[PDB]
Enzyme design. Sequence first.
Site, short mmCIF file in Angstrom:
data_model
loop_
_atom_site.label_atom_id
_atom_site.label_comp_id
_atom_site.label_asym_id
_atom_site.label_seq_id
_atom_site.Cartn_x
_atom_site.Cartn_y
_atom_site.Cartn_z
N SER B 146 0.86 -1.18 0.00
CA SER B 146 0.00 0.00 0.00
C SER B 146 0.88 1.22 0.00
CB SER B 146 -0.87 0.02 1.21
OG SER B 146 -1.55 1.28 1.33
N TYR B 159 -3.32 -1.02 10.00
CA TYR B 159 -3.15 -1.61 8.66
C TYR B 159 -1.73 -1.39 8.18
CZ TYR B 159 -3.79 -1.80 3.55
OH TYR B 159 -3.68 -1.94 2.20
N1 LIG Z 1 -7.85 0.74 -2.38
C1 LIG Z 1 -7.58 -0.54 -2.37
O1 LIG Z 1 -8.41 -1.35 -2.85
C2 LIG Z 1 -6.25 -0.91 -1.86
C3 LIG Z 1 -5.84 -2.20 -1.77
N2 LIG Z 1 -4.58 -2.55 -1.34
C4 LIG Z 1 -4.18 -3.94 -1.18
O2 LIG Z 1 -4.48 -4.66 -2.37
C5 LIG Z 1 -4.79 -6.01 -2.01
C6 LIG Z 1 -6.13 -6.36 -2.60
O3 LIG Z 1 -7.11 -5.42 -2.07
P1 LIG Z 1 -8.62 -5.39 -2.56
O4 LIG Z 1 -8.71 -5.91 -3.91
O5 LIG Z 1 -9.12 -4.02 -2.24
O6 LIG Z 1 -9.25 -6.45 -1.60
P2 LIG Z 1 -10.82 -6.96 -1.37
O7 LIG Z 1 -11.11 -6.65 0.02
O8 LIG Z 1 -11.67 -6.45 -2.49
O9 LIG Z 1 -10.70 -8.53 -1.52
C7 LIG Z 1 -10.03 -9.24 -0.48
C8 LIG Z 1 -9.67 -10.58 -1.04
O10 LIG Z 1 -8.86 -11.22 -0.03
C9 LIG Z 1 -9.57 -12.35 0.48
N3 LIG Z 1 -9.32 -12.40 1.91
C10 LIG Z 1 -9.58 -11.43 2.85
N4 LIG Z 1 -9.29 -11.81 4.06
C11 LIG Z 1 -8.88 -13.13 3.94
C12 LIG Z 1 -8.46 -14.08 4.86
N5 LIG Z 1 -8.39 -13.88 6.18
N6 LIG Z 1 -8.08 -15.26 4.40
C13 LIG Z 1 -8.12 -15.47 3.10
N7 LIG Z 1 -8.46 -14.67 2.09
C14 LIG Z 1 -8.87 -13.49 2.60
C15 LIG Z 1 -11.02 -12.18 0.08
O11 LIG Z 1 -11.66 -13.46 0.07
P3 LIG Z 1 -13.28 -13.58 0.09
O12 LIG Z 1 -13.74 -13.09 -1.25
O13 LIG Z 1 -13.52 -15.06 0.33
O14 LIG Z 1 -13.77 -12.68 1.21
C16 LIG Z 1 -10.89 -11.50 -1.29
O15 LIG Z 1 -10.53 -12.40 -2.30
C17 LIG Z 1 -4.70 -6.10 -0.48
O16 LIG Z 1 -3.39 -6.49 -0.09
C18 LIG Z 1 -4.93 -4.66 -0.08
O17 LIG Z 1 -4.39 -4.34 1.20
C19 LIG Z 1 -3.69 -1.55 -1.10
C20 LIG Z 1 -4.00 -0.27 -1.23
C21 LIG Z 1 -5.30 0.13 -1.54
#
Ligand SMILES: NC(=O)C1=CN([C@@H]2O[C@H](COP(=O)(O)OP(=O)(O)OC[C@H]3O[C@@H](n4cnc5c(N)ncnc54)[C@H](OP(=O)(O)O)[C@@H]3O)[C@@H](O)[C@H]2O)C=CC1
Lengths: 253, 252
Positions: B146, B159
């Site tokens: 991030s 976070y």
């Molecule tokens: N603005 C943003 O969107 C930003 C995102 N990021 C990073 O980008 C990455 C992707 O983010 P984003 O697309 O927004 O994420 P989402 O929250 O849209 O999706 C999360 C994904 O991770 C899975 N997941 C969440 N928690 C668990 C867990 N405990 N065990 C297993 N799988 C899990 C979910 O599974 P399920 O569908 O089964 O719930 C889903 O596939 C992350 O590392 C995030 O920190 C960084 C900066 C900004």
Amino acid sequence: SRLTGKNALVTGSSRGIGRATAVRLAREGALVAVHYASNEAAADETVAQIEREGGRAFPVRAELGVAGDVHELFLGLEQGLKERTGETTLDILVNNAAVTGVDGILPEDVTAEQLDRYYAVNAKAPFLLVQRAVRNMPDGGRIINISSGLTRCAVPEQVAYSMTKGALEQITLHMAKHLAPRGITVNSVAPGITDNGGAVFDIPEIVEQMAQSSAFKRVGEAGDVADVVTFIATDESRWITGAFIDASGGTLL
Amino acid sequence: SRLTGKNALVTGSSRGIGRATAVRLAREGALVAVHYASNEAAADETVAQIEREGGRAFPVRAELGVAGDVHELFLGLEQGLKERTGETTLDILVNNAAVTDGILPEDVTAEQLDRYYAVNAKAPFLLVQRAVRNMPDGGRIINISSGLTRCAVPEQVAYSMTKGALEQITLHMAKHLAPRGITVNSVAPGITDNGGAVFDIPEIVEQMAQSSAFKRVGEAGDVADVVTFIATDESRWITGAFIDASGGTLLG
Ligand SMILES: NC(=O)C1=CN([C@@H]2O[C@H](COP(=O)(O)OP(=O)(O)OC[C@H]3O[C@@H](n4cnc5c(N)ncnc54)[C@H](OP(=O)(O)O)[C@@H]3O)[C@@H](O)[C@H]2O)C=CC1
Ligand SMILES: NC(=O)C1=CN([C@@H]2O[C@H](COP(=O)(O)OP(=O)(O)OC[C@H]3O[C@@H](n4cnc5c(N)ncnc54)[C@H](OP(=O)(O)O)[C@@H]3O)[C@@H](O)[C@H]2O)C=CC1
């Protein structure tokens, strides 16, 4: 063929990383202006490689760091672009040419004339080339500054060179913000020690010492760096701007 | 077709950036393990898109940040790779899954700190440790960080701590794995539309958009396109790096 219908200028593409970059941009479909200062045969060899690989290119001679440098480069660039396309559009600028020397200069020996020459070619000319290039550049263009890992790695015998790469990287930072409204990205790509075809790379003993700087324990190939520059020149890098892109083979660990 | 014959795991690829990543890796020819925690329907949708586009994928369920998580994930991953390839080779790991308006510093609890770190830092480390057993020379490990590791936001301290830890996995494991030709890199998004309901609110989207130098929020594909390049051979000379995929958010 990610750069079909695009025009690119790679400064200092007669040799080394710049040649490898020109070759790869032209493989993607760009029309490439192969710029050089004096090694016309080497420039013609870059162009010949591009033509044999099915691409398009032309040489542009201009000594950077002297009065009228930007003017002279753009006269040749615009003539060549117009003859081949009817337009003078410049989609991609790679600021690659530099005063860059294996020998180095230890701090006690640096002269004011050397500080000026390094500055003029490696910092001032890139700035003024960006300023001129944007006039011809459509929304969605690319400016790529070739820096050095030495902006993050102390090497006394490269202090004078490194000052100028530190200034170059400021072009990246401040012009990325300036040009963002036009969708033009501006990024730095930082090589480590890279085989440019110089004599030092024919001395296996020195090559082995140099190779220890990389986490991979090899010197870079020109194409290792040029592959990264080529990606930045494509549409898929659109969300990267103002960045320092490490293309050093793990030298900056 | 830059990834023909390669096998990839994208954690958290049921949704958001991870879905966009899985789609793009599969377009390049990778067999993609589409990992999720509980949204099976969303995982099956990612898989269906990949198949309709002429690629190969399968879903893998594993809640991360609980006892037995890595084992559960690798049981499913290796079963699916062996059924489809006869091998358990893993070329590409993308540590994308995370726990992600924040929490004011005064309100952060010990339990919240533990959950963020279990999922966002600890699990990625243990997934790298397990994944390299299966990974040929020339492999790729990509950690999704991030831009908040470089931009102060008090309500994201908890976070951001875990993303700071994740980026250390990049640094130190890039040096460790360099002798195998495995690269390890961080890709740092800014605010990115992940299909969450807040991105349906044009007024909040317009406020979020101001963080980017381009004055738009990121699309998932903006980030996924960078991840996809890192997964290819042409990124071989990039290791241990922080790759800004934030749309100029760190320009201010
Ligand atoms: N603005 C943003 O969107 C930003 C995102 N990021 C990073 O980008 C990455 C992707 O983010 P984003 O697309 O927004 O994420 P989402 O929250 O849209 O999706 C999360 C994904 O991770 C899975 N997941 C969440 N928690 C668990 C867990 N405990 N065990 C297993 N799988 C899990 C979910 O599974 P399920 O569908 O089964 O719930 C889903 O596939 C992350 O590392 C995030 O920190 C960084 C900066 C900004
Ligand atoms: N190890 C390395 O090779 C490293 C390189 N870099 C950087 O990568 C870039 C390319 O380096 P490299 O390939 O090694 O360079 P080379 O020395 O092999 O080639 C230099 C190129 O720049 C041109 N050039 C030099 N001075 C001038 C000038 N005054 N006016 C116009 N053109 C000029 C040359 O033209 P001509 O052929 O006519 O002389 C040639 O095309 C440079 O920015 C360099 O600082 C960074 C780190 C390490």
